Design a protein around this ligand. Structure first.
Ligand SMILES: O=S(=O)(c1cccc(Cl)c1)n1ccc2c(N3CCNCC3)nc3ccccc3c21
Ligand SMILES: O=S(=O)(c1cccc(Cl)c1)n1ccc2c(N3CCNCC3)nc3ccccc3c21
Ligand SMILES: O=S(=O)(c1cccc(Cl)c1)n1ccc2c(N3CCNCC3)nc3ccccc3c21
Lengths: 390, 390, 390, 390, 390
C-alpha cells in the first residue's frame, strides 16, 4: 500500500539509536573499510610545514541494525539514509593542525545486508616534515594517518576498500598541471599503542609529491646568467678608463639586491638551507673575485708621481713568459739646459707610467682569460649536473 | 474555516519523511532540472589554479509526496515550504576545493503537482587548469560539473531547465566591467562511470572567460618603451666623455630592477612561461647589445700611451667605405733639438689618439644607426602583432 | 493568575506554524517595509570591485496570526518574541558576492495588531562598478538591492519605512572621519521581471560615496614636486663638469623607482586608467626632456681634438641674437719655429674649444630658462585645475 | 530521595518558556548589570579605523521564574543552568563592524532569589575614530557602547556591577607589554533616544589606550640621524674633487628610498597627516639645501676657460671680511717672445682659476659651519621637544 | 534478548539530564583530571604577541549517573556515548584571544563506575609575553591555564591525569623539525581567587620553546660578512684614483638598503629591541669610519693649486716615525728666463703635490692596517661569543 521506501525507512529508523555502536555482540568490532583518492594539492607551505590537500574520501562499515529482507519491501536492495540519522565512525587524521572547510554530504547508501557507504570530499590541512635540501627538485613524502580518535582496535578497526596497488596507482582525477606532481599514494597499516590494552588501529597513506623545477628556472637561472654575461662584457673595459671599478661595484650591487629579493621566495628549514644557496654564494664569490682583480689591475696601472720603474723580475716575467703564454752664450745655455731637464723629468715619469700600464694590460688580459675559463667550467659543471638528473 | 495555507501545510508536511527520496516507485529516478547563471568572477588565481565565481543557481524536481488538488484548499496552486522540511537533492560540484560562503535561502516553492523550485546563490571556489601562454590576452576555459555526490543515475538524474543555447547566450546580470570578460557558459551532459552499474549523471558548464589586456598595458609597455627611449637618448653621448658607460650600466640596473619587480605580477605555470617573457628578454638583449657596443667604442677611442697607429686596412675601410655609406752655438742647438724631440713625441701621440678617436666616432655613428633601425623594426613588429589580434 | 507575558506567549506560539506565510487570505501579499541606515564603509576594493559596508537594517511586516486583544492579557500592547519562532521574510541583497559576518538578533517586537519589527545589523560584501577615472577625487555610486530571493510580488512586496527624503538625509550615526565620505542614500523602487507573471519587487538604495583626496596628497604631490625641485637645482651644474649627466640619470632612476612603487597604490580598471597617470607621464616627459637637453649641451661643449671652428651661422645666431634676447743661427731658428708651431697648434685647439664652450653655455642658459618657464606653467595649470574643483 | 540538583532542575526548567522576558509584571524592566574587564588589545588598525580587543564580560539580571526556597532542595543556594535553557538579554555593542570569534560558555549560575550570572569572554572588532596627529605618542580614546539592540528602556535597562571608580582602576589581567598601553576604562550611562517613547539604555566604556613610542625609535630616528651624520662626513670632500655632487645625489637617493619605504609603516587619516611628516620634510629640505650649496660651490670653483678675474667687491668681501669672521737675432727673439706669450696666457688662466678656487674654498668653509650650526640647532630642538613630553 | 549496548544506552540515557552537574551530593565537586600533549607550534607571532599551538587534550571526570553493574548487561565494562548527550565541564584556557578551529570529537568513553573519558584535539591561539632580547637564540616561556570559566573550586576542581614529571618529559609526538623547538611542558596548580569564597581552580602548563638560530644565519651573518669583505677589498683602491669615495658611498647605500629590508624580518617589542641591533649598528659605524677615513685621505692627497708645502712636524712624523712603524743677447736671455720661471713654478707645484700624496699614502696604509685589525677583532669577538653559547 504505502511506498516501499517510506515503509523501509519507518521499519529501519524507528526505535533506532544513533549513539550506539551497531553490533549485536559488543565483543566484535566494526571493521571500517577505507579508501582515499587525491584530487588536488592546494598548498605546500615550507615555512610553517603544513600541507593543504583535497581528497575524495569514502568508507563503508557493516551496520547490523540497518538490515532487512528485500522481498518484504518491493525488492528494494539499497536506499539513501541521512548521515545524521545513523551511527558514523569518528575516523579522522592525526596530522590535522586546522579543520578543513569541505562540503557536507547529507546522505549515505545503506544495503539490505547492513553495508553503509559514506562518500565525502575532505580538505586537509596536515603537518608534515618538508625537507627542501633539493628545493628546486625536492620530492616530498607526506603522511596521512586515518584512525579513530577514541575507539580502540577492539571497537573500530580500519582496512582498505581496494588493494594497496590499486590505491598506489590511482592518478586519474588528480589535478596535474599545477606546481606539485603526485607520484603515488602508498597505504600502510599499523597498530598505534602506548599501553598493553589500548591499541589503536590506524591507516597511513604516504602522499609522495615531486616539485616541478620549471617554475623557478626563469626566476633563478636567468638573472644569474644575465649578470655573469654583463660581467664578462664589462671586463673588456680598459683598466685605466676610470669607470671599470664603478661598473663592477654597480654590478655587484645589482646582484646583491637580486639575491636579497629572491631570498623572499627561497624557503629555509631547521636541518639546513637549500643546496642552491651554495651555487648562489659561488656566483657571489666569482663576482667578488672579478672586482678584486679589477681593483688590483687599477692599482697596477694608476698613474701617480710616486711610481718607480718596474722591477727587473716583474718586467722579465710578465713581458716575456706571460706574453709568450698569451760671453753670455753660456748664460743662454743654462736656461735651455734647465728647460730640457724639466722636459726630461716629465718624459721619464711618462715612460715609467707607460711601462706600468703595459704590465697591467698584459696581466689583465691573462686574468680575464683565466676568469672566462673558470666561468665556462662552472657553467659546464652546472649543465652536466642538471643533465644527470634529467 | 482555517486558513488555506495552514491547512495545506498541515496536510502536506504531516507524517512526511524528509530522509526518503520522493518517489512512489523506487525504480524511477528523480529528474533534477538544473540552471546556472553567472553573476561575477570574484578571483582567478593562476598560482594555485583556483577559480572563484558567484553564480545564481536554481533547480526543480518533482516531489511525488507534496501533491494536492487546489479545489480543496481555496484554489491555492503554489506555496512556499521551508527548505529544511523537504527532501533536497545533494547536487554539488566535483571541481570544489573549498566551500563557498553563500547566503542560505530558507524557502522553496512547491506547486500543486509536486514541482519544487529551489533558488539559491552559490559562491564557488573550483580548481581549473589555467594556461597563461598568452597571459595578457589569454582566454580561459573553466569547467563546472554539477552531479550528485552519492546517488547514481538510477536515483538522481540531471537535465537542463532551459535549452543549451539560452544558457549559452545568458550574459544579462553578469558584472562586466571587471578584469575578466565572460564569453559564454556552455552546458554539456555526460555519464560519469567507472563501473558497469555505478553510472553517475553529471552536467558540465564550460565557463569561458577572456582577460582584458588593457589592465597591464601601462604596467608592461610603458616602462619598457620609456627605458628604450632613454637608451636612444643616452646613445647620443660622446664615447670619450667618460660617462656613457656609467649611463648604460645605470640604465641596465634600472631595467633589471623593473623586470624583477614586474615578475611579482607575471604568473607562471608548469607547462610553460608566458610568451611575453620572450619579448622582455629580447629587450634585455637589445640593452645588453647597446652596452657592449658602448664598451667596444670606449675601447677604440680611449687614449693611452700604448696606442699604435691605425692599421692600413682599418683606416681605409672605416674612413672611406663606411664614411661613404654614412763655438757654443752647436751646444745651444742640442738643447733645442731635444726640446723639439719631446714636443714631437707628444704631438705624434696626440695625432695617433686623434686618428683612433675619428675611427671610433665613425663606427659609433654607424652602429647607432643600426641599433636605431633594429629598435624601430622591433617596435613595428610588436605593433603589427598587436594589430592582427585586434 | 499566570503572568501576562507567559499567557500571551502560550496563546500566540501554540499551534503556530513558522513555515506558513502569515496571511488568512493567500491572495494578498505580506507588505514588508524596509529601512536602511549606513554605519560605516569598511572597505572599497577597486581591484575586485567589491564594496564592504556595515548598515543598520530594520523591517516590519504585518503577521496576521500574532494578534490579540490587550484587555485579555493585562493590557499588554507589545512583547518580544524569538526570531526563530516566527515566519521571517527572506529579504536579501542581489549584489551579494560573499556572506557578511554580523551579530544575530534573537528577538523581534510584536504588537497587538500583528506588526512584527525586526532590527538587525548587517555587514555587506556587495559587488559594484567602481570607476576610478578621477581616482583622487572620484565619487562612487554603489547600489544595494533588497528583494525576496524566492517570493514574487504577489507573495512579498517591499516598501519604505520612512519617506525617501528622510532616508536620503540620514547621516547621523555614519562613521565620518574615515577615507570615504557618504553623500546620500537614495531609495528607489522597481519591479524586476523577466516573465509575464514572475514579477519580483525590489528596493534599490543607491549608496553614493566620495573619496577624500587629502589621503594621497603627501603620497603623490610631494615626491613629484620634490624631484622637480632637485631637477631645477641640478640644472645649475656646469655642462662641462662631467657629472651633470650622472646627476640627471640618477634623478631619472629615482623618479622611475618612485613611479613603480606608487603604482602599487594606484588602482586600475578595464574601462580606463586614472587620469593622474597622464600627469605622471607628463612629469616623466619633462624629466626626459631635461636629460636630453643636458646630453645635447654636453655634446656641444665636450672638448675633443676633432672639433672644428664654430660655423658662421651658429656663431652669429647664438652669440648675437640669443645673447641679446637673454751660420748656425738659421739652424737655431728652425727648432724655435717648430716649438712655436706646436704651441700655436695647441693654442688654436684650445681657442676652438673655448668658442664651442661659450656657445654651449649660452644655449644652456636659454634652455634652462625655457625649462623653468615650462615647469612653472605646468605647476600653475595644476594649481588652477585643483582650485576649480575646490 | 532523588538528587537535590536533579529535583531543582526539574522544578525550575519544567514548563519554563525561554522566549518570555522573566517578569511577573510586564511593566517593570529587567535591570541588567554589566561589568567589563580588558584582557588584551589585539590590533589597532588606523587604516580602516577598527579596534580589535579581547575583554572579559560578565552580566547578571534577576530572573523571576528561576526562584526556589533552599530548604526544600537540601539547602542548595545556587546551581549551574545551561545558557540555552534560559532567557538571556541581547546586550551587544553598537560599535560592532564584524563579529568576533570567542569561546561559548555553556553554563550560567542561578541563585535561589533569581539572580542569574553570565560570564563570557568576548572578542570585539569595533569601529573607532583614530587620530594619529601625534602618531608616535598618540593616545586613543575608543568607545564601547553596550545596549539592547531591540528592547527599550522600559524592557531592558543597564547598570554597572561595580562602582565606576573600580571599573576605571581595573588593570590587573590586562596584557601589558604589547605595543598599546591601557590607561583606563571609563564607564558612562546615557539614554539613546530619537523618539518620544523609544528610549534605549546604553552603557559606554571609554577605552583609553596610549601607544608606546619606543617601538618606532629605531625605525625613524636611527636612519635620519645616520644619514645626517654621513651628510656631515661627506661635506668634508673638496668641492673641486669632482665626486662631491655624486656623493650628495647618492645620499639624497638613499634618503628618498628610505622615506618611501617608511611611508608603508606611517599611517594617515582624513583629518590630517601625522606631525612627524613635518620633521621628515624639514630633514629633506636640509639635505636639499646641502645639495644646492654643493652645486653652487662647484659652480664657483669649476675651472673653465671662460673664467674672468674675480670682481673687486667679491674678492674684498670674501677674502677679508669672511676670512676674518672665520741680423737674425731679431728673428730668434720673435719665436721666444711668442712662446713666452703662450706660457703667460696659460699662467694667467691658471692664476684666475686659483683665485676663484680660493674664494670657493672660503665660502664652502663658511657655509659648512653654518650648515653644521643649523643641524645642531635642529637636533637640540628635537631633543628638547622630546624632553618636555617625558 | 535485546543487544547489550542498546539496553545499556537505554538504561543510562533515559531520564538523564545533561544540564545537571553529575553528583548525588551537591556539596562534593567533580574532580576533572587533565592531560595535555603538545603536537605542533603552528605560529609564534612576536608583533601581536600571540602563540598558535596544536595540542592533544584529554580529560576524565567521575559521572555518578552513568553507572551500572556489568553482570546485568552481558559483562560490558565500557561503552561510547555521544558528547552531546552527557554533561561536559566547561574547561577552557584563560589566555585565549581567538577561538581555534579544531575537529569535533562526537564520542566519549564511559566506564561502569562512571569514569567518562573525553579525548579531543585543540588548536590554541593564546596571548603570551614574547621577549626577543636574544631574538636569534631566545627561549620563550608561554603559559596555558586550564580552568572552568564559571564553576568555582567547590563545583569543578582540576588535577593532572599523569604525574608532573611524565607531562614534563613528553616529547614523543611533537612535530620537531620546525622553527621552534619544544623544551618541556611544566604543569603547575594554583587557586585563582579575588574573593573570600569565589576560589577558582586552575592548571597552568608552562610551554617552554627555544628558537633554532640556524634559520637566520644565512639571512643575517652572510650579507654583513660579505659587505665587510667587499669593503676590505675596496680599501685597496688608491685614494687619488677618484673612484674610492664613489665605491664607499655605493657600498654604504647597499648596506643601508640591506638593513632596511632585513628590518622587515627583525621583530621588536616594547621592553626593548633585540640585542643584534647593537651589532648591526656597530657594523654601520665601522663602514662609516671607513668612509670618513677615505674622505680624509682624499682631502690630504687631492691636488689643487692652493696646496702649501708639508709642514715640518707632519713631514717628520709621518715620513719617519709612522714609516718605521710600518747687444740683443740680453733680450734673448730674458725670454728664456721667463720660460724657465714658468716651468719652475709648475715643477714646484708638482713636487708639493707629490709630497702630499706620499704623506697621504703612508697614512692610508697605516689606517688600513688599523681598520683591518679592528675588523678582525670584531669578528673574533663575535665568534667567541657564539662559541660560549654552543
Ligand atoms: O598513552 S598516552 O596517554 C601517552 C603517554 C605518553 C606519551 C604519549 Cl605520546 C601518549 N595516549 C595514548 C593515546 C592518546 C591520545 N589519542 C587517543 C587515540 N586517538 C588519538 C588521540 N590522546 C592523548 C591526549 C593527551 C594525552 C595522552 C594521549 C594519548
Ligand atoms: O529612530 S530611528 O529610525 C532613526 C531615524 C533617523 C536617524 C537615525 Cl540615526 C535613527 N532608529 C532608532 C533606533 C534605531 C535602530 N536601533 C534600535 C536600538 N538598538 C540599536 C539599533 N536601528 C535602526 C535601523 C534602521 C533605521 C533606523 C533605526 C533606528
Ligand atoms: O572578582 S572579579 O570581579 C575582579 C575584580 C577586580 C579585578 C579583577 Cl581582575 C577581577 N572577577 C573574578 C573572576 C572573574 C571572571 N572569571 C570567572 C572565572 N573564570 C574566568 C572569568 N570574569 C570577570 C569578568 C568581568 C569582571 C570581573 C570578572 C571576574
Amino acid at each position: 500500500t504505502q511506498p516501499a521506501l517510506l515503509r523501509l525507512s519507518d521499519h529501519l529508523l524507528a526505535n533506532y539509536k544513533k549513539g550506539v555502536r551497531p553490533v549485536r555482540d559488543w565483543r566484535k568490532p566494526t571493521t571500517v573499510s577505507i579508501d582515499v583518492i587525491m584530487y588536488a594539492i592546494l598548498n605546500v607551505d615550507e615555512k610553517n610545514q603544513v600541507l593543504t590537500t583535497y581528497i575524495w574520501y569514502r568508507q563503508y562499515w557493516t551496520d547490523e541494525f540497518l538490515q532487512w529482507t528485500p522481498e518484504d519491501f518491493d525488492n528494494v536492495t539499497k536506499l539513501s539514509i541521512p548521515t545524521d540519522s545513523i551511527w558514523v565512525p569518528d575516523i579522522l587524521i592525526n596530522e590535522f593542525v586546522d579543520v578543513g572547510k569541505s562540503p557536507n554530504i547529507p546522505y549515505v547508501y545503506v544495503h539490505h545486508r547492513g553495508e553503509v557507504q559514506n562518500y565525502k570530499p575532505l580538505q586537509l590541512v596536515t603537518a608534515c616534515s618538508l625537507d627542501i635540501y633539493n628545493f628546486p627538485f625536492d620530492v616530498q613524502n607526506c603522511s596521512l594517518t586515518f584512525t579513530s580518535w577514541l575507539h580502540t582496535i577492539q571497537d573500530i578497526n580500519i582496512t582498505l576498500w581496494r588493494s594497496p596497488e590499486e590505491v598506489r596507482s590511482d592518478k586519474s582525477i588528480f589535478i596535474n598541471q599545477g606546481e606539485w606532481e603526485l607520484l603515488e599514494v602508498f597505504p600502510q597499516f599499523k597498530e598505534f599503542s602506548i599501553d598493553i590494552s589500548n591499541s589503536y588501529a590506524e591507516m597511513k597513506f604516504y602522499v609522495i609529491i615531486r616539485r616541478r623545477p620549471l617554475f623557478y628556472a626563469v626566476s633563478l637561472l636567468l638573472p644569474s646568467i644575465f649578470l655573469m654575461v654583463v660581467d664578462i662584457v664589462g671586463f673588456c673595459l680598459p683598466p685605466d678608463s676610470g669607470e671599470r671599478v664603478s661598473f663592477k661595484i654597480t654590478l655587484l650591487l645589482g646582484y646583491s639586491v637580486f639575491l636579497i629579493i629572491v631570498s623572499d621566495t627561497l624557503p629555509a628549514t631547521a636541518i639546513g638551507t637549500p643546496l642552491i644557496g651554495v651555487y648562489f654564494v659561488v656566483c657571489m664569490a666569482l663576482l667578488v673575485i672579478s672586482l678584486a682583480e679589477t681593483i688590483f689591475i687599477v692599482r697596477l696601472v694608476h698613474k701617480q708621481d710616486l711610481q718607480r720603474p718596474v722591477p727587473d723580475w716583474l718586467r722579465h716575467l710578465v713581458l716575456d713568459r706571460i706574453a709568450w703564454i698569451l760671453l753670455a752664450v753660456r748664460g743662454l745655455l743654462q736656461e735651455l739646459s734647465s728647460i730640457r731637464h724639466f722636459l726630461e723629468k716629465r718624459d721619464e715619469m711618462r715612460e715609467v707610467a707607460r711601462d706600468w700600464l703595459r704590465v697591467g694590460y698584459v696581466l689583465d688580459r691573462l686574468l680575464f682569460r683565466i676568469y672566462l675559463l673558470a666561468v665556462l667550467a662552472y657553467s659546464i659543471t652546472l649543465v652536466t649536473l642538471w643533465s644527470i638528473w634529467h
